[PDB]
Amino acid sequence: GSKAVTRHRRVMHFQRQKLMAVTEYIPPKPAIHPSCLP
Amino acid sequence: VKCTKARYLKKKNMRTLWINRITAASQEHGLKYPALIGNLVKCQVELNRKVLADLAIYEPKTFKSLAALASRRRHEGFAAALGDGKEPEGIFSRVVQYH
């Protein structure tokens, strides 16, 4: 197979790929955009 | 071997056929299959696909009564989603309890 360190980005196990997709930064969204407010 | 493995396909293809016939009878009344099955369960009506598709062919006036009931329970769910609990539950949204 392939070593742990590679010159190319190595494809993840699907379980890990799903984990990385769930654990994504979600920025806070204010109820009203600050620009619309005085 | 084919006849022995075909007993799993027969049961699968039947339910696929029933659903296709229910979907067709629900669109005649402006409904979709998920809104009929899901809201008949909410009215404690436990009728399976086999019976429902049989009713759509041989008892059309009874199937429209079931579709009108599902549409009524579906509209009560939206009304309750607009309130914050203060408004009481709908007439067809009540659930009979069994002890």
């Binding site: - | 998920p34 099955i37 899901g38 369960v41 909410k42 436990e46 659930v95 309890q97 069994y98």
Partner: protein, 40 residues
């Protein structure tokens, strides 16, 4: 369908699990006599 909604009403996800539909006897004698308990 409806499994999660049934769970919110203190019911089983499958109506076959418990309740009147499954627990109650399926038939009885016309005279009125009760039938012997079902195996299940």
């Amino acid at each position: 369908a409806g499994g999660q909604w049934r769970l919110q009403q203190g019911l089983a996800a499958n109506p076959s699990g418990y309740g009147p539909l499954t627990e109650l006897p399926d038939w009885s004698y016309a005279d009125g006599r009760p039938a012997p308990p079902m195996k299940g």
